Amino acid sequence: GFKQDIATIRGDLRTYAQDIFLAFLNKYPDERRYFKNYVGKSDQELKSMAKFGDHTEKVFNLMMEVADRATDCVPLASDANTLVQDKQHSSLTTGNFEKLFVALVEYMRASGQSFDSQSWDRFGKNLVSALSSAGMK
Ligand code: HEM
Ligand SMILES: [C-]#N
Numbered sequence: 001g002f003k004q005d006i007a008t009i010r011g012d013l014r015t016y017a018q019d020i021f022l023a024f025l026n027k028y029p030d031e032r033r034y035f036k037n038y039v040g041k042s043d044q045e046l047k048s049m050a051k052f053g054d055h056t057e058k059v060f061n062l063m064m065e066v067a068d069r070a071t072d073c074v075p076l077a078s079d080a081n082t083l084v085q086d087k088q089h090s091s092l093t094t095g096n097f098e099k100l101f102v103a104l105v106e107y108m109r110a111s112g113q114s115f116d117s118q119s120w121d122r123f124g125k126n127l128v129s130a131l132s133s134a135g136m137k
Contacts, residue, residue: 002073002119005108006064014053017060022046024103031099066127073123080130093137094128101127 009016022043025032032038035055038046046052066079083089083097101124108115 001116005115014057017056020104020107021056023107024100027103028099074126081134084134084136094131
């Protein structure tokens with residue numbers, strides 16, 4: 001279930017973080033231009049970049065924290081607010097986050113692993129709603 005998935009993802013955090021983030025940029029190429037140092041690089045070129053590994057680790061580390069603090073796949077309003085008030089995410093709309101979770105849920109289904117994809121779908125949707133409520137457009 002959801003709680004086991006957080007353990008699975010944490011167990012190989014860099015590998016999952018990089019793969020899902022890559023699935024996200026490739027499915028939604030417009031989102032690549034938010035990350036200027038990732039423009040014009042192939043999957044393996046990005047995986048050879050130290051800063052890509054580091055960034056993706058930190059993102060999925062935080063996502064797992066929010067997921068672990070969540071009750072029944074609903075994240076904390078203060079966790080949502082953190083994402084909304086952050087300098088780096090100030091010029092985003094909830095649409096960017098929705099796309100990340102589509103790519104994440106798709107990835108889970110296409111993998112061979114027994115991920116609880118429906119719980120991650122709910123989690124994504126509840127996070128998006130919590131982002132709107134905190135003032136994200
Ligand atoms: C729940 C989902 C997300 C989480 C948990 C998250 C978290 C983070 C964190 C912790 C950082 C700082 C990493 C560091 O210190 O290097 C960061 C950077 C950033 N994120 Fe996100 N993020 C999420 C979704 C998104 C989305 C959907 C976008 C837009 C496509 C986005 C755009 C950015 C940008 C532009 C930066 C700054 C780039 C840089 O470090 O040079 N984030 N994010
Ligand atoms: C943030 N990626």
